[PDB]
Every structure is written in C-alpha cells, then in structure tokens.
C-alpha cells in the first residue's frame, strides 16, 4: 500500500507528517496502430488479364511495370483463374514482400503447350517462341479461355513460329517472319515442298477438346536489384485511435503517444511535425489528409501525503501533473488541482493555514 511504500522509501517504520515522493506514475500503450497511405494507384495485372487479344507466343508482350502499389490479393480472389503455379517465390507472399521490377507477358496457347512454357522445360513451341529461363523467380498464371477466345467456326487470331534456326535466348522475343530453310534447297521467298513457312495457324474451337483449347497464360517475372524497389504489395494497416495512448507507426516513424486532432495546418508536401526540441509533435495520417497531434503518454510522480504514523495511518496520494481521468484506487474522494489529481483527500471550502504543502495553493491536513 502507499503508506508502506513511503516507509520503504524513508527506510523508517515511522513517517513524519508531510508529502513524500515514492514512485512514478506511467501509462503504458494499450494498443498498437500501424498506418500507411492506401492503394491509390494499382499495378494493372488485371489489364493484361483483360486484354482482348493476347500477344503471340513468339512475339510475347513484355510489360515492365514500376512505381505503383500492386494488389496481388485480387489475383487469389479471382475465381476464373485456373493455374497459379509459382517458381522460387510463394504464391501468397507477393503481397508480403516485393521486388524492384515486374515483367508481365500475355499470350494464348493450347492447354498441352501451357506446361511447355515453364522453366527447365523445353517444347516444340517453347524452344523457338518463348523459353523461360531455368533460374528466374516468378509465377505463371494460366486459365482456360475457350468461351472468350474461340468460336464455332474457329479462331485463327493466335499463331506460333514452329521453326527457328537457333536456340532462343532467355527473355528474347523473335518477331522475324522469314521463311524457314527446312530443306537444303534455298527458299528464295517462295513456299515449296522442301521449304516450310515457320508460322502455323492454330484453330481454336470448343469441340476441339480440352488440352488444346486456348489458354490465356500470363507469366510474372520478379527481379530485385540495387535500385530501389517501387512495386510492392499492400502493407498492413489498422484503424486510427484517438485520445487513447497507443503505439503508432505512420510510415515508419515508430513513436508512442496519444493521438488528438490538431488545428495546425501542414503544408501539402510536409508529412510530420517537430517542436523546438526536435521531438515529433504532430503527424499527418497517411490514409486521410488530416493532421494528428502527438502528445506523450501521461506520466508523473506519485507522492504520498501522510500525517505522522503517530497521528494516523491514512494516506492521500497525489499524482503530479496527471489528469486523473487517466488514472489507492480511484473513486476515493478524487479531487483535481493544478499540482495533480489528489486521491484520498476531500476538498473543503473553508481555509486554514497550510499544513502539508501540495502545490499551487492547495495544502492538505489531518482534521475532522
């Protein structure tokens, strides 16, 4: 109890009349809040998913995207997706951790040829149209698009280059339309029995069967370099808490305190504020554009007001410089003054000479 704390701090079994500072009142953070500015721009993976005509397998479109927040959660949320196999990276860790740049390649190919477009796997089309490097870190997204990309008559929009003179370089797209010299006799630009044109036309039809239907296949390439990383998943955010002492993480400021609305007006470029002593005084909420004042958690000295143990064993506790809305247990004749909020003493309007000085004109005493 406070009286025994006073006895220990005085190292005497009898404490004389007076006020003794025994301990320190401290308010610990109840909650922890983390905020980052929300999505705003979004990296358009759905756009290359939603492209009406996917690029040719040999002339695969290379889309390098940077400086945007990427939402990979919608990719898992999307039901029509059928294949999400990943190599060197967790499918669900794209949101958690990020790379510097992302390459998206959109192409339409038959179902059996989808497995041919994979690292460490070579195919009749893959070796000459699109050969994924063995060691790249990325995910291949594939799904059936027979209804969207085929008709009863037949879809000949998508074609591939069957014959190529040399092995394809990694991350290289071949757009050459030269007639392949399959035969020993020179082609000279004229199709013949020996010379076969490398490009062949697929026919996509619903009746053509599964394993050969068109598949909208998108491969995402992630590479992290010395340059700063600009595309990342949505970092965790929490709700805003006002008038309660909480740990706050406003884009990595990492401070503790109680957050209140402030009348101060920041400049548009400015993010947080500092006082004369170079202490964070106000922060702007990244989610909104409002300005939040940061005042520290309430703390102060705990002083025990006691008459002599010869007189009595009752004690009144003073919490210096603390609003006792934030605070012997409260509810026992709790009275508030400038020196602090006094617990255990009842304010009396009549005035006597000072007995135990509390502060700011308030003096405690033991009387009936």
């Amino acid at each position: 109890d406070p009286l025994s704390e006073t006895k220990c701090t005085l190292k005497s079994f009898t404490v004389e009349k007076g006020i003794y500072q025994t301990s320190n009142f401290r308010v610990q953070p109840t909650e922890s809040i983390v905020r980052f500015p929300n999505i705003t721009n979004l990296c358009p993976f759905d756009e290359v998913f939603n492209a009406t005509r996917f690029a040719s397998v040999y002339a695969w479109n290379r889309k390098r995207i940077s400086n945007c927040v990427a939402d990979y959660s919608v990719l898992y949320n999307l039901a029509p997706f059928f294949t999400f196999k990943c190599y060197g990276v967790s499918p669900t860790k794209l949101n958690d951790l990020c790379f510097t740049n992302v390459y998206a390649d959109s192409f339409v190919i038959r179902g059996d040829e989808v497995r041919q477009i994979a690292p460490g796997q070579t195919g009749n089309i893959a070796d000459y149209n699109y050969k994924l490097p063995d060691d790249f870190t990325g995910c291949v997204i594939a799904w059936n698009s027979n209804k969207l990309d085929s008709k009863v008559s037949g879809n000949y929009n998508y074609l591939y280059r069957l014959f190529r003179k040399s092995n394809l370089k990694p991350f290289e797209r071949d757009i050459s339309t030269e007639i392949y010299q399959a035969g020993n006799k020179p082609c000279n630009g004229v199709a013949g029995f020996n010379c076969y044109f490398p490009l062949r036309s697929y026919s996509f039809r619903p009746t053509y069967g599964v394993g050969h239907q068109p598949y909208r296949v998108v491969v995402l390439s992630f590479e992290l370099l010395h340059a700063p990383a600009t595309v990342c998943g949505p970092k965790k955010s929490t709700n805003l808490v006002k008038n309660k002492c909480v740990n706050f993480n406003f884009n990595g400021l990492k401070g503790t305190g109680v957050l209140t609305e402030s009348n101060k007006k920041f400049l548009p470029f400015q993010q947080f504020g500092r006082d004369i002593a170079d202490t964070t005084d106000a922060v702007r909420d990244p989610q909104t554009l409002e300005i939040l004042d940061i005042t520290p958690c309430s703390f102060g000295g705990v002083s025990v007001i006691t008459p002599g143990t010869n007189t009595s064993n009752q004690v009144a506790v003073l919490y210096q410089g603390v609003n006792c809305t934030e605070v012997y247990s409260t509810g026992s004749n709790v009275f508030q003054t400038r020196a602090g909020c006094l617990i255990g003493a009842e304010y009396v309007n009549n005035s006597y000479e000072c007995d135990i000085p509390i502060g700011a004109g308030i003096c405690a005493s033991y009387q009936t």
Epitope: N77, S90, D135
Partner: antibody, heavy 116, light 112 residues
Framework: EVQLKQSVAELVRPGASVKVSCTAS????????MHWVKQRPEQGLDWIGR????????RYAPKFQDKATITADTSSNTAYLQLSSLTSEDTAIYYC?????????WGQGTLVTVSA | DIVMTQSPSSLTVTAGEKVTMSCKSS????????????LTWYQQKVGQPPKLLIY???TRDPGVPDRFTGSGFGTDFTLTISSVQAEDLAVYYC?????????FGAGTKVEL
Amino acid sequence: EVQLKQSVAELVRPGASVKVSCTASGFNIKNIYMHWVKQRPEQGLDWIGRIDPANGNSRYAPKFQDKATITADTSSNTAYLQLSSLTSEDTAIYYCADEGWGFANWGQGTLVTVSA
Amino acid sequence: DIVMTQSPSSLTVTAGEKVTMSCKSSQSLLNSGNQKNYLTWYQQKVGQPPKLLIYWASTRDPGVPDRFTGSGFGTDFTLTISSVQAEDLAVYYCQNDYSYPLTFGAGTKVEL
C-alpha cells in the same frame, strides 16, 4: 532451378540438440517463408512449422509446442533446425517446403536418430 | 487439427485401371473470394522426396499431367488416376491448406 539443400545427417549424443541447415540455392530465401515437416519411415507425414526470413514469427503445430523450434538466416539463405532430447520414435526425416498451394520444393531428407 | 480419414486401400492392377482415393476434411474448408478450396495431394516415389501432385483440389500442375479431377465443397475431395504405372507407383498424402492447422495424409500405396 530452385534447390533447397539438406544438411548431412549428424550423429547426436542422447538428450542433446540436433541442427540441420536448409540453405537455398539459385534464389534468395527472402521471398520464401519455408515450412518444416517431419516424416517417420512407414508412418504418416507431419507438419512442424514455418520460418520467415525477417520477422520470422514461427508458428508450430499444437503437438510440437514448446519443444520444436525452427529459425532461418536471411544472409546466405540458410535455415536451421532446433530439436533436443528426441526419442528414437519421435525422430523423423525432416523436409523443407515451398509453402505454395502445395509444397512444390522438398529437401532430399535427413535421416537423423539418436545414436551417439 | 482438422479431422481427416484417407482410405489406405492398395490395388495391384494393370495399367488402364482407374483408382479412386478420397479423404474427408472437416469444417468444409472454403477460401474467401474465390470458389477454389485449398486442398492438395502429393506423390512420393519410394526413396525420393514427395512432390506437388495436385493443388486447389481441381487443378493439375505441370508434370505427368492427366485428369485428377476432384469434386467437393470442402467436406471431401476425391483424387482419381486413370492408369497405374511404375511412375505413378508411389505413396500419396492429402493435406488441407485453407485451414492453418495442417494435417497430412495417413498414406496410400498402389501396386502393379
């Protein structure tokens, strides 16, 4: 492509700790929060837990609580196993995981048993 | 923690014989956002580490790809193989994924 190497099996004194390393080759471990699993010969497979390279916050199976601990080091893509005072039946072959939709990448396996 | 019961029946059959293997999954696991459920199967050749056989319970990964369709609402999923050969001769475990407590398959073998 992407390979996870298991540490060679070390004979361990009875009632002591045993450590097995799962280093990643061909790719940094930073993008992978690998999972540890234990398999006993002629017995069902079990899931030990997982490690994240940064803020690892490893969460273990309820049966293995307070006795099975696993950690990894981001530098050199190394991982580790921490298991001590294992009985012969409890000891099982440990594998690493790709934590995908299914565990695509698995270690070659470590047959570790208390033999001293 | 999720209750699982995998049929360990083993059949010594010639190639071209279908086999049906299913294991119950309690709580009827259902991923939010997408209709796909996170249930997977593994194929482990004797003396070799297991590898991903099937993921999402209805999607066939590249690598010996053939059918393996499974129909269920999270209460149960059935994995079917059209033909049995030495390559498919292995031990299979079905492990739930949507539920964070992960319990692996008891084990199922096939013979030629």
